[PDB]
mmCIF file with all atom_site columns, all heavy atoms in Angstrom:
data_model
loop_
_atom_site.group_PDB
_atom_site.id
_atom_site.type_symbol
_atom_site.label_atom_id
_atom_site.label_alt_id
_atom_site.label_comp_id
_atom_site.label_asym_id
_atom_site.label_entity_id
_atom_site.label_seq_id
_atom_site.pdbx_PDB_ins_code
_atom_site.Cartn_x
_atom_site.Cartn_y
_atom_site.Cartn_z
_atom_site.occupancy
_atom_site.B_iso_or_equiv
_atom_site.pdbx_formal_charge
_atom_site.auth_seq_id
_atom_site.auth_comp_id
_atom_site.auth_asym_id
_atom_site.auth_atom_id
_atom_site.pdbx_PDB_model_num
ATOM 1   N N   . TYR A 1 120 ? 88.198  101.493 37.427 1.00 32.88 ? 124 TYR A N   1
ATOM 2   C CA  . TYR A 1 120 ? 88.651  102.539 36.533 1.00 32.88 ? 124 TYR A CA  1
ATOM 3   C C   . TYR A 1 120 ? 90.138  102.766 36.408 1.00 32.88 ? 124 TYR A C   1
ATOM 4   O O   . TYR A 1 120 ? 90.860  102.844 37.388 1.00 32.88 ? 124 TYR A O   1
ATOM 5   C CB  . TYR A 1 120 ? 87.946  103.838 36.904 1.00 32.88 ? 124 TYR A CB  1
ATOM 6   C CG  . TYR A 1 120 ? 88.339  104.965 36.047 1.00 32.88 ? 124 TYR A CG  1
ATOM 7   C CD1 . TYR A 1 120 ? 87.851  105.070 34.761 1.00 32.88 ? 124 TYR A CD1 1
ATOM 8   C CD2 . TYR A 1 120 ? 89.202  105.936 36.510 1.00 32.88 ? 124 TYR A CD2 1
ATOM 9   C CE1 . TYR A 1 120 ? 88.219  106.117 33.947 1.00 32.88 ? 124 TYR A CE1 1
ATOM 10  C CE2 . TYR A 1 120 ? 89.578  106.987 35.700 1.00 32.88 ? 124 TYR A CE2 1
ATOM 11  C CZ  . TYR A 1 120 ? 89.086  107.068 34.423 1.00 32.88 ? 124 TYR A CZ  1
ATOM 12  O OH  . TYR A 1 120 ? 89.447  108.119 33.604 1.00 32.88 ? 124 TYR A OH  1
ATOM 13  N N   . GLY A 1 121 ? 90.587  102.903 35.171 1.00 33.68 ? 125 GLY A N   1
ATOM 14  C CA  . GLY A 1 121 ? 92.005  103.057 34.926 1.00 33.68 ? 125 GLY A CA  1
ATOM 15  C C   . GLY A 1 121 ? 92.699  101.702 34.927 1.00 33.68 ? 125 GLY A C   1
ATOM 16  O O   . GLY A 1 121 ? 92.036  100.668 34.956 1.00 33.68 ? 125 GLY A O   1
ATOM 17  N N   . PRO A 1 122 ? 94.024  101.725 34.791 1.00 33.68 ? 126 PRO A N   1
ATOM 18  C CA  . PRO A 1 122 ? 94.882  100.530 34.791 1.00 33.68 ? 126 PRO A CA  1
ATOM 19  C C   . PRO A 1 122 ? 95.120  99.857  36.140 1.00 33.68 ? 126 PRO A C   1
ATOM 20  O O   . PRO A 1 122 ? 95.253  100.530 37.165 1.00 33.68 ? 126 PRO A O   1
ATOM 21  C CB  . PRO A 1 122 ? 96.219  101.073 34.282 1.00 33.68 ? 126 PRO A CB  1
ATOM 22  C CG  . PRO A 1 122 ? 95.886  102.382 33.640 1.00 33.68 ? 126 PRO A CG  1
ATOM 23  C CD  . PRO A 1 122 ? 94.785  102.942 34.469 1.00 33.68 ? 126 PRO A CD  1
ATOM 24  N N   . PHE A 1 123 ? 95.213  98.527  36.105 1.00 32.20 ? 127 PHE A N   1
ATOM 25  C CA  . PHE A 1 123 ? 95.451  97.701  37.294 1.00 32.20 ? 127 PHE A CA  1
ATOM 26  C C   . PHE A 1 123 ? 96.620  96.735  37.045 1.00 32.20 ? 127 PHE A C   1
ATOM 27  O O   . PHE A 1 123 ? 96.972  96.476  35.897 1.00 32.20 ? 127 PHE A O   1
ATOM 28  C CB  . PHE A 1 123 ? 94.188  96.912  37.644 1.00 32.20 ? 127 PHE A CB  1
ATOM 29  C CG  . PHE A 1 123 ? 93.066  97.769  38.132 1.00 32.20 ? 127 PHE A CG  1
ATOM 30  C CD1 . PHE A 1 123 ? 92.334  98.545  37.245 1.00 32.20 ? 127 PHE A CD1 1
ATOM 31  C CD2 . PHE A 1 123 ? 92.746  97.808  39.479 1.00 32.20 ? 127 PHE A CD2 1
ATOM 32  C CE1 . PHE A 1 123 ? 91.315  99.345  37.690 1.00 32.20 ? 127 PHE A CE1 1
ATOM 33  C CE2 . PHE A 1 123 ? 91.725  98.613  39.921 1.00 32.20 ? 127 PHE A CE2 1
ATOM 34  C CZ  . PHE A 1 123 ? 91.017  99.382  39.021 1.00 32.20 ? 127 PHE A CZ  1
ATOM 35  N N   . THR A 1 124 ? 97.192  96.175  38.109 1.00 32.50 ? 128 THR A N   1
ATOM 36  C CA  . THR A 1 124 ? 98.369  95.334  37.954 1.00 32.50 ? 128 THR A CA  1
ATOM 37  C C   . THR A 1 124 ? 98.106  93.866  38.004 1.00 32.50 ? 128 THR A C   1
ATOM 38  O O   . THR A 1 124 ? 97.494  93.298  37.099 1.00 32.50 ? 128 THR A O   1
ATOM 39  C CB  . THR A 1 124 ? 99.420  95.597  39.051 1.00 32.50 ? 128 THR A CB  1
ATOM 40  O OG1 . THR A 1 124 ? 98.778  95.579  40.335 1.00 32.50 ? 128 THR A OG1 1
ATOM 41  C CG2 . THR A 1 124 ? 100.044 96.963  38.911 1.00 32.50 ? 128 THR A CG2 1
ATOM 42  N N   . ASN A 1 125 ? 98.652  93.263  39.063 1.00 31.23 ? 129 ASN A N   1
ATOM 43  C CA  . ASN A 1 125 ? 98.630  91.824  39.316 1.00 31.23 ? 129 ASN A CA  1
ATOM 44  C C   . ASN A 1 125 ? 97.254  91.173  39.327 1.00 31.23 ? 129 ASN A C   1
ATOM 45  O O   . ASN A 1 125 ? 97.073  90.145  40.002 1.00 31.23 ? 129 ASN A O   1
ATOM 46  C CB  . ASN A 1 125 ? 99.267  91.546  40.673 1.00 31.23 ? 129 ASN A CB  1
ATOM 47  C CG  . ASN A 1 125 ? 100.696 92.017  40.751 1.00 31.23 ? 129 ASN A CG  1
ATOM 48  O OD1 . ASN A 1 125 ? 100.957 93.196  40.986 1.00 31.23 ? 129 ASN A OD1 1
ATOM 49  N ND2 . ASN A 1 125 ? 101.643 91.090  40.553 1.00 31.23 ? 129 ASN A ND2 1
ATOM 50  N N   . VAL A 1 161 ? 89.813  102.315 41.782 1.00 22.40 ? 165 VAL A N   1
ATOM 51  C CA  . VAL A 1 161 ? 91.041  102.763 41.216 1.00 22.40 ? 165 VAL A CA  1
ATOM 52  C C   . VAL A 1 161 ? 92.176  102.096 41.997 1.00 22.40 ? 165 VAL A C   1
ATOM 53  O O   . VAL A 1 161 ? 92.036  101.822 43.188 1.00 22.40 ? 165 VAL A O   1
ATOM 54  C CB  . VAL A 1 161 ? 91.043  104.346 41.359 1.00 22.40 ? 165 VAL A CB  1
ATOM 55  C CG1 . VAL A 1 161 ? 92.353  104.882 41.849 1.00 22.40 ? 165 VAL A CG1 1
ATOM 56  C CG2 . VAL A 1 161 ? 90.567  105.035 40.078 1.00 22.40 ? 165 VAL A CG2 1
ATOM 57  N N   . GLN A 1 162 ? 93.249  101.736 41.303 1.00 21.15 ? 166 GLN A N   1
ATOM 58  C CA  . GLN A 1 162 ? 94.467  101.234 41.937 1.00 21.15 ? 166 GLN A CA  1
ATOM 59  C C   . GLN A 1 162 ? 95.527  102.281 41.634 1.00 21.15 ? 166 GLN A C   1
ATOM 60  O O   . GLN A 1 162 ? 96.185  102.208 40.601 1.00 21.15 ? 166 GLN A O   1
ATOM 61  C CB  . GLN A 1 162 ? 94.918  99.935  41.306 1.00 21.15 ? 166 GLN A CB  1
ATOM 62  C CG  . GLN A 1 162 ? 96.241  99.498  41.866 1.00 21.15 ? 166 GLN A CG  1
ATOM 63  C CD  . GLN A 1 162 ? 96.860  98.308  41.181 1.00 21.15 ? 166 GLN A CD  1
ATOM 64  O OE1 . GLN A 1 162 ? 96.610  98.023  40.003 1.00 21.15 ? 166 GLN A OE1 1
ATOM 65  N NE2 . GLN A 1 162 ? 97.690  97.614  41.923 1.00 21.15 ? 166 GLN A NE2 1
ATOM 66  N N   . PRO A 1 163 ? 95.728  103.223 42.537 1.00 19.86 ? 167 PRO A N   1
ATOM 67  C CA  . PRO A 1 163 ? 96.539  104.412 42.242 1.00 19.86 ? 167 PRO A CA  1
ATOM 68  C C   . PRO A 1 163 ? 97.933  104.119 41.676 1.00 19.86 ? 167 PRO A C   1
ATOM 69  O O   . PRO A 1 163 ? 98.448  104.906 40.878 1.00 19.86 ? 167 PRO A O   1
ATOM 70  C CB  . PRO A 1 163 ? 96.634  105.120 43.595 1.00 19.86 ? 167 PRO A CB  1
ATOM 71  C CG  . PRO A 1 163 ? 95.447  104.615 44.362 1.00 19.86 ? 167 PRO A CG  1
ATOM 72  C CD  . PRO A 1 163 ? 95.269  103.179 43.933 1.00 19.86 ? 167 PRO A CD  1
ATOM 73  N N   . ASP A 1 164 ? 98.531  102.997 42.057 1.00 17.21 ? 168 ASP A N   1
ATOM 74  C CA  . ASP A 1 164 ? 99.849  102.708 41.541 1.00 17.21 ? 168 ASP A CA  1
ATOM 75  C C   . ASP A 1 164 ? 99.832  102.646 40.029 1.00 17.21 ? 168 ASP A C   1
ATOM 76  O O   . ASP A 1 164 ? 100.205 103.599 39.376 1.00 17.21 ? 168 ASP A O   1
ATOM 77  C CB  . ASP A 1 164 ? 100.411 101.448 42.180 1.00 17.21 ? 168 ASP A CB  1
ATOM 78  C CG  . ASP A 1 164 ? 100.591 101.612 43.671 1.00 17.21 ? 168 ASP A CG  1
ATOM 79  O OD1 . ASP A 1 164 ? 100.611 102.776 44.119 1.00 17.21 ? 168 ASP A OD1 1
ATOM 80  O OD2 . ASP A 1 164 ? 100.703 100.668 44.472 1.00 17.21 ? 168 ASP A OD2 1
ATOM 81  N N   . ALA A 1 165 ? 99.327  101.557 39.475 1.00 20.70 ? 169 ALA A N   1
ATOM 82  C CA  . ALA A 1 165 ? 99.340  101.352 38.026 1.00 20.70 ? 169 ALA A CA  1
ATOM 83  C C   . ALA A 1 165 ? 99.275  102.604 37.146 1.00 20.70 ? 169 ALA A C   1
ATOM 84  O O   . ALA A 1 165 ? 99.372  102.495 35.930 1.00 20.70 ? 169 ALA A O   1
ATOM 85  C CB  . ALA A 1 165 ? 98.261  100.360 37.621 1.00 20.70 ? 169 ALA A CB  1
ATOM 86  N N   . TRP A 1 166 ? 99.126  103.782 37.743 1.00 20.93 ? 170 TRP A N   1
ATOM 87  C CA  . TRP A 1 166 ? 99.047  105.019 36.960 1.00 20.93 ? 170 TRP A CA  1
ATOM 88  C C   . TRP A 1 166 ? 100.254 105.969 37.115 1.00 20.93 ? 170 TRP A C   1
ATOM 89  O O   . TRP A 1 166 ? 100.945 105.945 38.135 1.00 20.93 ? 170 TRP A O   1
ATOM 90  C CB  . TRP A 1 166 ? 97.767  105.749 37.299 1.00 20.93 ? 170 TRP A CB  1
ATOM 91  N N   . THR A 1 167 ? 100.494 106.801 36.098 1.00 20.27 ? 171 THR A N   1
ATOM 92  C CA  . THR A 1 167 ? 101.551 107.826 36.140 1.00 20.27 ? 171 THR A CA  1
ATOM 93  C C   . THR A 1 167 ? 101.877 108.385 34.759 1.00 20.27 ? 171 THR A C   1
ATOM 94  O O   . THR A 1 167 ? 101.069 109.086 34.159 1.00 20.27 ? 171 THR A O   1
ATOM 95  C CB  . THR A 1 167 ? 102.819 107.291 36.799 1.00 20.27 ? 171 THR A CB  1
ATOM 96  N N   . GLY A 1 168 ? 94.528  106.517 36.801 1.00 18.91 ? 175 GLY A N   1
ATOM 97  C CA  . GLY A 1 168 ? 93.551  107.504 37.227 1.00 18.91 ? 175 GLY A CA  1
ATOM 98  C C   . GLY A 1 168 ? 94.149  108.630 38.059 1.00 18.91 ? 175 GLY A C   1
ATOM 99  O O   . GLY A 1 168 ? 95.330  108.577 38.425 1.00 18.91 ? 175 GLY A O   1
ATOM 100 N N   . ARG A 1 183 ? 91.498  99.963  45.189 1.00 17.57 ? 190 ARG A N   1
ATOM 101 C CA  . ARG A 1 183 ? 91.163  98.560  44.939 1.00 17.57 ? 190 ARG A CA  1
ATOM 102 C C   . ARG A 1 183 ? 91.027  97.747  46.210 1.00 17.57 ? 190 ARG A C   1
ATOM 103 O O   . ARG A 1 183 ? 90.206  96.803  46.274 1.00 17.57 ? 190 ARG A O   1
ATOM 104 C CB  . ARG A 1 183 ? 92.177  97.922  44.018 1.00 17.57 ? 190 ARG A CB  1
ATOM 105 C CG  . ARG A 1 183 ? 91.706  96.606  43.505 1.00 17.57 ? 190 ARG A CG  1
ATOM 106 C CD  . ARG A 1 183 ? 92.824  95.628  43.226 1.00 17.57 ? 190 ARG A CD  1
ATOM 107 N NE  . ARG A 1 183 ? 93.565  95.918  42.008 1.00 17.57 ? 190 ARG A NE  1
ATOM 108 C CZ  . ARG A 1 183 ? 94.870  95.669  41.848 1.00 17.57 ? 190 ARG A CZ  1
ATOM 109 N NH1 . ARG A 1 183 ? 95.575  95.187  42.845 1.00 17.57 ? 190 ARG A NH1 1
ATOM 110 N NH2 . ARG A 1 183 ? 95.475  95.969  40.700 1.00 17.57 ? 190 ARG A NH2 1
#
Side-chain angles (χ1 to χ4, degrees), residues 124-129 165-169 175 190:
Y124 180 76
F127 292 75
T128 49
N129 300 82
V165 135
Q166 174 187 26
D168 297 342
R190 193 210 285 147

